[PDB]
Symmetry: D2
Subunit: 98 residues, 4 copies
């Protein structure tokens, strides 16, 4: 889905991500989460899984990494807000991190 | 360790790998295992973790992949047999696959 | 395309791949090429680019790697032969191997 | 090397990195450069090569990526400044970005 999340969609989809540790940013319609792995080997393997999914979906994260930490911000730059693509990528990221 | 595994070392280290599904090849002093993941995303993330470890250890697998399957053969080409490096890489691979 | 290459498509698409060093396997309707890099760092970086494309196009290689060598066989298992998807993937692989 | 670069080492090693486009950060004893690629496929392939080297040398970058852009900051957190390990990693990164 490429359109902005509606109010109903947000209520359906975002609370589960928040329970998983995602937060909504104050300055942007975007979601954010920092992941902490044991080490860089785990973190980068995880990033690779996310990168593969990003190319599958043609939807890419904004992310920062140092060693075992990966900070991920998701939003859809083509419409300047959250879409179902961001939700789907977040849900995949949760699977990959597990 | 870069020297061939001694008989005692083999008895100490190989049975655990065999219990995990590794086998010894008939034609070469090498160990082998096929891993089966859900899909290529999982398989390639796993390969990436192994690749990182391979560069950390300077010790590389012989491996075949198609989609969700990864076949790995470990042996030390510099001395033409199994060494502790092969055991350590196999043990890491077991962690990464889990 | 999910159907086997026609005779016409083979005459149009394969010569360029052969010129680039791919061969048609004797026992399978598949194409094959080995790539050699300076080391594993380069070889695996290349494999990662191919892996990303494989997920983008939902079409996957058969491949073997040992250190700096990557042997790639392309064919479509869902129909048991060579399709336009295999040609497209080969063309990407050529770009990646040449660092384009 | 795990100790901060000496004055002499800085005069010998940094100019080449500056010539290659690295800057020394104002607020940290660290070097910084942004790399731009054609797309994410290329950018992430490059990141994978850097990741492999990071594990080889047990020394890791700080980096940010969005699509085709990769921003890299190098510094050694174990001592809180720039070391020979950072210079070595930068030199590898230059090779990787140039497809060498």
């Amino acid at each position: 889905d490429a359109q902005w999340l509606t109010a109903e969609e947000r209520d359906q989809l975002i609370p589960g991500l928040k329970a998983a540790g995602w937060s909504e940013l104050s300055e942007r319609d975007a979601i954010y989460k920092e992941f902490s792995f044991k080490n860089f080997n785990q973190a980068f393997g995880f990033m690779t899984r996310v990168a593969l999914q990003a190319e599958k979906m043609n939807h890419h994260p904004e992310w920062f990494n140092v060693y075992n930490k990966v900070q991920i911000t998701l939003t859809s730059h083509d419409c300047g807000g959250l879409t179902k693509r961001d939700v789907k990528l977040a849900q995949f990221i949760e699977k990959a991190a597990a």
